[PDB]
Amino acid sequence: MEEVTIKANLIFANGSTQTAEFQGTFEQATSEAYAYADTLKQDNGEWTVDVADQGYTLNIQFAG
Secondary structure, eight states: OOOEEEEEEEEOTTSOEEEEEEEESHHHHHHHHHHHHHHHHHHHOOEEEEEEGGGTEEEEEEOO
8 A cells, every 4th residue: 555665776896886776665675675785795795784865765885
C-alpha cells in the first residue's frame, strides 16, 4: 500500500562510480543497499555508508 525507493551512490577506491536504486519497504531497501555493498567488499575492500535525504539517499565509499 505504501513503500519507498532508496538511491545508493557507490564510490570505488579505483575512482569509478555506480548508482543502485532499491524499491520496497524503508527497512528492505536499506538492507538491500548494504547487501550489494557487502558482496563488493571482497574486490573493493571495507566501506563506510552515510545517511542522506532522510535515508532515501545513501552514500557508500569503499576504503579500498
